């Protein structure tokens, strides 16, 4: 598809690279650093490369109006959820240290100006912008000014809307990814629209492309690798019996390992060209292709015809099935036995 | 992608239809009708819709030269394998009756003129042509003359080669499918080249597109659904401990059920357009989009600026984050409290 690439720390990302799975722990820790550490342990032990957090500073993120609005996958106000779930600066700094102490890359999604400045103080190697802030052009400008790569979710937004965000990003001169995304928790298969990935890469030829996913399993993400996706994001939990509005669409260690294995196969299998000559197929061609044979006894001097000629495996005859019709009307130079391959010396 | 369709018996096939999995029992029965019936039972009980056989009449299929050539996935001559494995006319007619007695569609691949005439006598509803006969234009002409749809594998052949086959097919006026395929047993992931499917549909806009597969698992086939594949073919066996050169790349009842479930999800998830407005996302937009707020106390009469304005969730303010800059320079009509959403009545 393309050769766009950039680095998140030491990890190269892009079409010619192994797909990257982002383990979005998000608010799954329910505000408990202990729980967050257990989930980081589970992610490390499953082989995860990247852990993503969400950086919530409720006062800079929401006006009082947020205390009256309820999200789709919850039964209380968004302000209550974020107040209950948010880690303070001290705890989030400990979370970054812990993730990196396990050899993994820590990134996070800022939901406010204050969160973005905190992540800059911590010097994270790349920024995620959630689909809710895809059209928050003031916030994107700030984050782009940090000089780090940006991974931008694009749910709830048109290509025309996304263009303004990409413009801001290009102007700051940082590389970026676009994650196709549908922000319904959970997302029904029929609303995934994997074709949206092609729409994004077609509109934005310099973007790394991936999928942020909220379905109940790995199928959408595996199809996105098949379509050329380079970054896959699903929520992550150490076990499925945890409480939380995002747990149910999360992967756990087992299903993370499956996605990793599926994505590696699909990275290998994807792309390429129909007409590529595959050396491993040569033995098969040699026995499976047909050659021209006599369909009857043909006397010396008789004319070769569609009536005394046919074609049979294997493919080592002097004349291939491709040349069948070119023998019509040639003259038998010898007697020719029924069933014999037609030889170059069988015709004048 | 497209709206091409045709019918195999009562089963509609094509991009707007459920993907069809062809259970290729092939020569997996090792010449035993009993074994073939056990494998048909296993396919029925797993929910299979179509069972494919291979119709081998060794004398019409191979000249004596085939007694000296060995295939890649075997250790004796192709002639010996086919002689040992082939069902005679009486047994194959029983196989078709049995498949249809379980409510399934029976099709088969002819490897010779004689095999094609036998399948015509049995009146099968569609013909498969294997990748070895993709360039057997005499055989394709015969099969196309039968008036039934054709499902053509395209391994070992260029687009330019396939064009001659499609020309013959179009001339007889039967609908057809093209299965991308790599004829290595088993096929390494890296040789699948799923992009070959796009090459085929681009060159042949009227074709139904699918994949014939010989890898060790379902990943290639699942990626082919994601890419728009309508027909998926893998070898099938009732259990993996059977003998046979094709067993090891076969599905069994369990892995057939997985492919069926994956393909149904990917059929739902695939295609579509980025800019489609998704009703289920509306609640999320309402709380996640930002509105313009006062970043400071602003006295009556003061000018609105980038310095006393910012943006915060949720999205029910009078001014969206989109209109942030249009408020610059407006005049405060009332005193405005820090943190308050900017109201239409807050500006002259």
mmCIF file of C-alpha atoms in Angstrom, chain A residues 56 59-66 69-72 78 82 111 113 131-133 135-139 141-142 154-160 162 164 179-185 189-196 199-200 217 219-220 222-224 226-227 258 261-262 264-266 268-276 278 280-281 283-290 293 295 310-314 316 321-322 324-325 339 341, chain B residues 56 59-66 69-72 78 82 111 113 131-133 135-139 141-142 154-160 162 164 179-185 189-196 199-200 217 219-220 222-224 226-227 258 261-262 264-266 268-276 278 280-281 283-290 293 295 310-314 316 321-322 324-325 339 341:
data_model
loop_
_atom_site.group_PDB
_atom_site.id
_atom_site.type_symbol
_atom_site.label_atom_id
_atom_site.label_comp_id
_atom_site.label_asym_id
_atom_site.label_seq_id
_atom_site.Cartn_x
_atom_site.Cartn_y
_atom_site.Cartn_z
ATOM 1 C CA UNK A 56 -8.157 12.864 33.205
ATOM 2 C CA UNK A 59 -11.801 20.459 36.131
ATOM 3 C CA UNK A 60 -9.971 21.316 32.876
ATOM 4 C CA UNK A 61 -11.854 18.632 30.897
ATOM 5 C CA UNK A 62 -15.484 19.423 31.716
ATOM 6 C CA UNK A 63 -17.610 22.378 32.677
ATOM 7 C CA UNK A 64 -20.373 21.874 35.230
ATOM 8 C CA UNK A 65 -22.633 20.843 32.352
ATOM 9 C CA UNK A 66 -20.824 17.485 32.334
ATOM 10 C CA UNK A 69 -24.872 14.221 30.988
ATOM 11 C CA UNK A 70 -24.728 10.409 31.020
ATOM 12 C CA UNK A 71 -22.654 8.373 28.521
ATOM 13 C CA UNK A 72 -24.045 5.494 26.494
ATOM 14 C CA UNK A 78 -19.482 11.408 32.834
ATOM 15 C CA UNK A 82 -14.004 10.507 35.521
ATOM 16 C CA UNK A 111 -8.661 14.918 27.435
ATOM 17 C CA UNK A 113 -5.154 21.210 28.036
ATOM 18 C CA UNK A 131 -12.296 10.496 18.797
ATOM 19 C CA UNK A 132 -13.982 13.021 21.092
ATOM 20 C CA UNK A 133 -11.089 15.449 20.589
ATOM 21 C CA UNK A 135 -12.371 18.094 16.235
ATOM 22 C CA UNK A 136 -10.873 19.860 19.292
ATOM 23 C CA UNK A 137 -8.599 21.984 17.138
ATOM 24 C CA UNK A 138 -7.344 24.111 20.067
ATOM 25 C CA UNK A 139 -6.252 20.925 21.888
ATOM 26 C CA UNK A 141 -2.676 22.590 18.181
ATOM 27 C CA UNK A 142 -1.338 22.399 21.731
ATOM 28 C CA UNK A 154 -11.303 9.637 13.763
ATOM 29 C CA UNK A 155 -14.693 8.392 14.976
ATOM 30 C CA UNK A 156 -17.697 10.705 14.890
ATOM 31 C CA UNK A 157 -15.889 12.863 12.299
ATOM 32 C CA UNK A 158 -16.023 13.367 8.536
ATOM 33 C CA UNK A 159 -13.002 13.331 6.237
ATOM 34 C CA UNK A 160 -13.676 17.048 5.816
ATOM 35 C CA UNK A 162 -10.405 15.398 9.908
ATOM 36 C CA UNK A 164 -8.542 20.501 9.598
ATOM 37 C CA UNK A 179 -7.157 5.265 13.434
ATOM 38 C CA UNK A 180 -10.522 4.463 11.956
ATOM 39 C CA UNK A 181 -12.983 4.105 14.790
ATOM 40 C CA UNK A 182 -16.664 3.770 15.724
ATOM 41 C CA UNK A 183 -17.414 5.082 19.205
ATOM 42 C CA UNK A 184 -20.205 2.777 20.357
ATOM 43 C CA UNK A 185 -19.590 0.624 23.417
ATOM 44 C CA UNK A 189 -20.006 -5.755 13.579
ATOM 45 C CA UNK A 190 -22.219 -3.997 11.043
ATOM 46 C CA UNK A 191 -21.107 -0.540 12.209
ATOM 47 C CA UNK A 192 -17.355 -1.176 11.862
ATOM 48 C CA UNK A 193 -17.130 -0.194 8.152
ATOM 49 C CA UNK A 194 -13.591 -1.448 7.537
ATOM 50 C CA UNK A 195 -13.713 0.403 4.190
ATOM 51 C CA UNK A 196 -13.364 3.633 6.158
ATOM 52 C CA UNK A 199 -11.174 6.302 2.688
ATOM 53 C CA UNK A 200 -8.683 7.687 5.210
ATOM 54 C CA UNK A 217 -13.690 -9.751 19.769
ATOM 55 C CA UNK A 219 -12.390 -10.112 14.051
ATOM 56 C CA UNK A 220 -12.579 -6.411 13.152
ATOM 57 C CA UNK A 222 -7.805 -8.949 12.138
ATOM 58 C CA UNK A 223 -9.626 -7.641 9.075
ATOM 59 C CA UNK A 224 -7.910 -4.302 9.575
ATOM 60 C CA UNK A 226 -5.645 -7.719 6.189
ATOM 61 C CA UNK A 227 -6.581 -4.265 4.811
ATOM 62 C CA UNK A 258 -4.539 -14.431 19.663
ATOM 63 C CA UNK A 261 -0.666 -14.157 16.356
ATOM 64 C CA UNK A 262 -3.400 -13.338 13.865
ATOM 65 C CA UNK A 264 1.558 -11.474 12.448
ATOM 66 C CA UNK A 265 0.078 -13.965 9.975
ATOM 67 C CA UNK A 266 -1.984 -11.293 8.245
ATOM 68 C CA UNK A 268 2.794 -11.698 6.164
ATOM 69 C CA UNK A 269 -0.186 -12.691 4.008
ATOM 70 C CA UNK A 270 -1.401 -9.220 3.021
ATOM 71 C CA UNK A 271 -0.578 -7.123 -0.014
ATOM 72 C CA UNK A 272 1.489 -8.407 -2.900
ATOM 73 C CA UNK A 273 0.579 -8.862 -6.546
ATOM 74 C CA UNK A 274 -1.322 -11.579 -8.400
ATOM 75 C CA UNK A 275 1.331 -12.032 -11.085
ATOM 76 C CA UNK A 276 4.275 -12.643 -8.753
ATOM 77 C CA UNK A 278 6.274 -18.106 -6.702
ATOM 78 C CA UNK A 280 7.495 -22.956 -4.435
ATOM 79 C CA UNK A 281 4.781 -23.537 -7.073
ATOM 80 C CA UNK A 283 6.892 -28.569 -8.830
ATOM 81 C CA UNK A 284 3.104 -28.219 -9.029
ATOM 82 C CA UNK A 285 3.208 -26.587 -12.469
ATOM 83 C CA UNK A 286 5.457 -29.382 -13.692
ATOM 84 C CA UNK A 287 2.942 -32.157 -12.955
ATOM 85 C CA UNK A 288 -0.375 -30.242 -13.121
ATOM 86 C CA UNK A 289 -0.146 -28.395 -16.485
ATOM 87 C CA UNK A 290 -1.271 -30.342 -19.567
ATOM 88 C CA UNK A 293 -1.247 -35.872 -26.853
ATOM 89 C CA UNK A 295 -6.244 -38.746 -29.208
ATOM 90 C CA UNK A 310 -6.147 -33.768 -26.998
ATOM 91 C CA UNK A 311 -4.264 -32.619 -23.868
ATOM 92 C CA UNK A 312 -3.205 -34.418 -20.688
ATOM 93 C CA UNK A 313 -0.992 -34.037 -17.623
ATOM 94 C CA UNK A 314 1.863 -33.761 -16.987
ATOM 95 C CA UNK A 316 6.747 -32.012 -19.896
ATOM 96 C CA UNK A 321 -1.890 -27.004 -23.893
ATOM 97 C CA UNK A 322 -1.272 -23.368 -24.878
ATOM 98 C CA UNK A 324 -2.852 -26.995 -28.888
ATOM 99 C CA UNK A 325 -4.454 -25.202 -31.822
ATOM 100 C CA UNK A 339 -2.070 -41.437 -25.986
ATOM 101 C CA UNK A 341 2.710 -36.850 -26.258
ATOM 102 C CA UNK B 56 -10.291 -38.466 -11.335
ATOM 103 C CA UNK B 59 -6.434 -42.653 -18.200
ATOM 104 C CA UNK B 60 -8.011 -39.463 -19.620
ATOM 105 C CA UNK B 61 -6.156 -37.220 -17.132
ATOM 106 C CA UNK B 62 -2.546 -38.338 -17.573
ATOM 107 C CA UNK B 63 -0.329 -39.829 -20.225
ATOM 108 C CA UNK B 64 2.240 -42.426 -19.195
ATOM 109 C CA UNK B 65 4.616 -39.554 -18.445
ATOM 110 C CA UNK B 66 2.634 -38.952 -15.241
ATOM 111 C CA UNK B 69 6.577 -37.366 -11.957
ATOM 112 C CA UNK B 70 6.228 -36.838 -8.195
ATOM 113 C CA UNK B 71 4.206 -33.963 -6.666
ATOM 114 C CA UNK B 72 5.564 -31.617 -4.022
ATOM 115 C CA UNK B 78 0.941 -38.495 -9.249
ATOM 116 C CA UNK B 82 -4.733 -40.726 -8.317
ATOM 117 C CA UNK B 111 -9.323 -33.090 -14.150
ATOM 118 C CA UNK B 113 -12.519 -34.408 -20.498
ATOM 119 C CA UNK B 131 -5.403 -24.109 -10.779
ATOM 120 C CA UNK B 132 -3.730 -26.833 -12.845
ATOM 121 C CA UNK B 133 -6.452 -26.533 -15.494
ATOM 122 C CA UNK B 135 -4.764 -22.683 -18.645
ATOM 123 C CA UNK B 136 -6.351 -25.879 -20.049
ATOM 124 C CA UNK B 137 -8.371 -23.938 -22.593
ATOM 125 C CA UNK B 138 -9.689 -27.073 -24.357
ATOM 126 C CA UNK B 139 -11.060 -28.352 -21.019
ATOM 127 C CA UNK B 141 -14.306 -24.739 -23.411
ATOM 128 C CA UNK B 142 -15.869 -28.147 -22.801
ATOM 129 C CA UNK B 154 -6.127 -18.959 -10.705
ATOM 130 C CA UNK B 155 -2.890 -20.158 -9.094
ATOM 131 C CA UNK B 156 0.232 -20.568 -11.206
ATOM 132 C CA UNK B 157 -1.294 -18.225 -13.816
ATOM 133 C CA UNK B 158 -0.901 -14.587 -14.839
ATOM 134 C CA UNK B 159 -3.772 -12.149 -15.316
ATOM 135 C CA UNK B 160 -2.875 -12.308 -19.006
ATOM 136 C CA UNK B 162 -6.477 -15.936 -16.998
ATOM 137 C CA UNK B 164 -8.042 -16.271 -22.199
ATOM 138 C CA UNK B 179 -10.473 -17.778 -6.689
ATOM 139 C CA UNK B 180 -7.071 -16.381 -5.897
ATOM 140 C CA UNK B 181 -4.812 -19.261 -4.991
ATOM 141 C CA UNK B 182 -1.220 -20.332 -4.300
ATOM 142 C CA UNK B 183 -0.616 -24.001 -5.057
ATOM 143 C CA UNK B 184 1.971 -24.954 -2.444
ATOM 144 C CA UNK B 185 1.053 -27.634 0.079
ATOM 145 C CA UNK B 189 1.735 -17.012 5.013
ATOM 146 C CA UNK B 190 4.191 -14.879 3.054
ATOM 147 C CA UNK B 191 3.195 -16.472 -0.264
ATOM 148 C CA UNK B 192 -0.556 -15.836 0.083
ATOM 149 C CA UNK B 193 -0.499 -12.302 -1.427
ATOM 150 C CA UNK B 194 -4.055 -11.323 -0.493
ATOM 151 C CA UNK B 195 -3.628 -8.291 -2.788
ATOM 152 C CA UNK B 196 -3.925 -10.684 -5.723
ATOM 153 C CA UNK B 199 -5.750 -7.526 -8.986
ATOM 154 C CA UNK B 200 -8.315 -10.085 -10.151
ATOM 155 C CA UNK B 217 -5.156 -22.210 9.448
ATOM 156 C CA UNK B 219 -6.117 -16.439 8.915
ATOM 157 C CA UNK B 220 -5.676 -16.098 5.143
ATOM 158 C CA UNK B 222 -10.507 -14.472 7.212
ATOM 159 C CA UNK B 223 -8.433 -11.733 5.598
ATOM 160 C CA UNK B 224 -9.995 -12.619 2.264
ATOM 161 C CA UNK B 226 -12.226 -8.658 5.021
ATOM 162 C CA UNK B 227 -11.024 -7.847 1.471
ATOM 163 C CA UNK B 258 -14.521 -20.938 13.492
ATOM 164 C CA UNK B 261 -18.161 -17.503 12.513
ATOM 165 C CA UNK B 262 -15.239 -15.306 11.520
ATOM 166 C CA UNK B 264 -19.992 -13.912 9.172
ATOM 167 C CA UNK B 265 -18.499 -11.187 11.374
ATOM 168 C CA UNK B 266 -16.194 -9.975 8.617
ATOM 169 C CA UNK B 268 -20.849 -7.605 8.428
ATOM 170 C CA UNK B 269 -17.799 -5.491 9.287
ATOM 171 C CA UNK B 270 -16.341 -5.083 5.793
ATOM 172 C CA UNK B 271 -16.862 -2.344 3.240
ATOM 173 C CA UNK B 272 -18.812 0.804 3.973
ATOM 174 C CA UNK B 273 -17.704 4.423 3.962
ATOM 175 C CA UNK B 274 -15.840 6.547 6.502
ATOM 176 C CA UNK B 275 -18.343 9.407 6.405
ATOM 177 C CA UNK B 276 -21.454 7.349 7.157
ATOM 178 C CA UNK B 278 -23.865 6.222 12.722
ATOM 179 C CA UNK B 280 -25.481 4.750 17.759
ATOM 180 C CA UNK B 281 -22.644 7.295 18.127
ATOM 181 C CA UNK B 283 -24.909 9.874 22.719
ATOM 182 C CA UNK B 284 -21.103 9.817 22.580
ATOM 183 C CA UNK B 285 -20.906 12.984 20.474
ATOM 184 C CA UNK B 286 -23.222 14.718 22.923
ATOM 185 C CA UNK B 287 -20.909 14.258 25.924
ATOM 186 C CA UNK B 288 -17.490 13.967 24.214
ATOM 187 C CA UNK B 289 -17.411 17.035 21.899
ATOM 188 C CA UNK B 290 -16.204 20.302 23.456
ATOM 189 C CA UNK B 293 -16.074 28.303 27.886
ATOM 190 C CA UNK B 295 -11.102 30.779 30.701
ATOM 191 C CA UNK B 310 -11.069 27.880 26.090
ATOM 192 C CA UNK B 311 -13.077 24.722 25.281
ATOM 193 C CA UNK B 312 -14.425 21.896 27.443
ATOM 194 C CA UNK B 313 -16.800 18.931 27.364
ATOM 195 C CA UNK B 314 -19.670 18.416 27.005
ATOM 196 C CA UNK B 316 -24.264 21.298 24.563
ATOM 197 C CA UNK B 321 -15.142 24.059 19.584
ATOM 198 C CA UNK B 322 -15.503 24.538 15.813
ATOM 199 C CA UNK B 324 -13.874 28.942 18.926
ATOM 200 C CA UNK B 325 -12.001 31.494 16.838
ATOM 201 C CA UNK B 339 -15.604 28.209 33.557
ATOM 202 C CA UNK B 341 -20.107 28.069 28.692
#
